Ligand binder design. Structure first.
Ligand SMILES: [Ca+2]
Ligand SMILES: [Cl-]
Length: 496
């Protein structure tokens, strides 16, 4: 068998970013910034021909309804996609395609983003081509409306329609061949891997058959004999018949418990305590780190589509807590870390549901997408926040070192190091703390990289609130004066 859960990064780089609904021209430009800040790669929105939905006007979710496997999408043309992949690969920042293989469109008919028609009522997709024989139907799904209802029934979850999305027959050799041709075309252009959408709704054996058809990566950039990187979106918070552990033999799996648990802890929901993170990871009932793709939020659950609705998951709308959770995730050693990168929208929670959760990316109309301008109130650019990218640098310097020198106060303050490379103190209490601890670091003067620009003096004050330098004594102990409130954490580390 082939295993696909191993990614490939340039030395010093590891973290990936979901540039949600970014155009190809903007990602191509961003790859220089990403390389300079030693990110490893970018998850891109579905790049194949997708539905154009005009009621409501051009929602983000139209891109999760494929119309064909041509490569003209809201983010740009096939030419712009290949320009992006070439430029990014040449910079050592790789591309992971959001691959939508479980389904085509919902009901109704229309014209996709590349001019091909679709008809969900007659199951006709002439741009592929698919017809009714290529879909699950009444022979495979016994629910009255043909949709999924009982998530304790794996056959229903995998053969019925997710919210009416016409469900492809992944057991058929024709569908397996067509979908592998799509993936291999993108690998041939230089794509490094795939975020596979809706994997809980597909049979592992069908995924195995598709992945077995894949070509290895393009040796213009990648080592000879290297499998594509595959991570699978499987939503598994327990209490269902489909499990994340069914998919880990194929590749990595999205661990949604990770963001649920860190969200509840940092929010202090129902008496949670930051000190409980002392054993965070697989010991919390999660996937092993080697099999997991981890993240604080993603494009679905920042819109309330995850467990709890709103109130557990942390997003850029809860920026201070979001930064605390992301800093912990980046400083810890658990999973392949993905950072969400978002756009603003008029989130309007009524009875626990966002009435405006459909709104697409910043647009001037007609279904276009604006050019990105970070921090303009429309593009959030979390990956460009100093607290984020400086903790990515911390994460990179710490690579290969275990967690060491753990301390906690029993409640909402913790601290720990990564070997002799970095140390972080997180004060989620409502009072200030002065505490001397073994940091494990060599004696010297360090800057707090949460508030400052650099890791050593001169610390750099581009954010205006760079804290006083931290002195690590000869014995490695440092005295941490850590305040409560905004950015209530100090992180120090050595040079690469
Ligand atoms: Ca299915
Ligand atoms: Cl995901």
């Amino acid at each position: 068998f082939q295993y696909f859960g191993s990614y490939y990064c340039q030395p010093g780089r590891d973290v990936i970013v979901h540039l949600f609904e970014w155009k190809w021209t903007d990602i191509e430009r961003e790859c220089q910034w990403l390389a300079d800040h030693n990110y490893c790669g970018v998850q891109v929105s579905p790049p194949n021909e997708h539905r154009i939905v005009t009621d409501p006007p051009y929602p983000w979710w139209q891109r999760y309804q494929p119309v064909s496997y041509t490569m003209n999408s809201r983010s740009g043309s096939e030419t712009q996609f290949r320009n992006m992949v070439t430029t990014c690969n040449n910079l050592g920042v790789y591309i992971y395609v959001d691959g939508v293989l479980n389904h085509m469109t919902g009901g109704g008919s229309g014209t996709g983003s590349d001019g091909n028609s679709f008809d969900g009522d007659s199951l006709q997709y002439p741009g592929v081509p698919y017809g009714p024989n290529d879909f699950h139907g009444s022979d495979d799904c016994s629910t009255s409306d043909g949709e999924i209802h009982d998530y304790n029934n794996p056959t229903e979850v995998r053969n019925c329609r997710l919210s009416g999305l016409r469900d492809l027959d992944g057991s058929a050799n024709y569908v397996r061949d067509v979908e592998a041709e799509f993936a291999n075309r993108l690998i041939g252009w230089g794509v490094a891997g795939f975020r596979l959408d809706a994997c809980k709704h597909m049979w592992p054996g069908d995924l195995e058959a598709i992945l077995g058809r894949l070509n290895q990566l393009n040796t213009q950039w990648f080592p000879a004999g290297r499998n594509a990187y595959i991570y699978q979106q499987v939503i598994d918070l327990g209490g269902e018949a489909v499990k994340a552990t069914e998919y880990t033999y194929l590749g990595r799996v999205t661990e949604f418990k990770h963001g649920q648990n860190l969200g509840n802890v940092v929010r202090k929901n129902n008496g949670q305590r930051l000190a409980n993170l002392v054993n965070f990871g697989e010991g919390w009932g999660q996937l092993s780190g080697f099999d997991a793709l981890v993240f604080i939020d993603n494009h679905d659950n920042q819109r309330g589509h995850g467990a709890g609705g709103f109130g557990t998951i942390l997003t850029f709308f809860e920026a201070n807590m979001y930064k605390i959770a992301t800093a912990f995730e980046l400083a810890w050693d658990y999973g392949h870390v993905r950072l969400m990168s978002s756009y603003n929208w008029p989130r309007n929670i009524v009875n626990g549901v966002d009435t405006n959760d459909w709104v697409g990316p910043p647009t001037n109309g007609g279904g276009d997408t604006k050019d990105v301008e970070c921090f303009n109130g429309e593009w959030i650019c979390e990956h460009r926040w100093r607290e984020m990218y400086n903790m990515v640098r911390f994460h990179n310097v710490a690579i290969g070192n275990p967690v060491s020198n753990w301390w906690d106060n029993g409640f909402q303050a913790i601290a720990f190091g990564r070997g002799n490379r970095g140390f972080i103190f997180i004060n989620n209490e409502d009072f200030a703390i002065t505490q001397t601890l073994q940091t494990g670091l060599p004696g010297g003067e360090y800057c707090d990289v949460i508030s400052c620009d650099n890791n050593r003096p001169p610390c750099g004050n581009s954010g205006g609130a760079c804290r006083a330098t931290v002195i690590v004594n000869g014995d490695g102990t440092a005295t941490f004066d850590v305040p409560n409130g905004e950015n209530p954490m100090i992180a120090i580390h050595v040079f690469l």
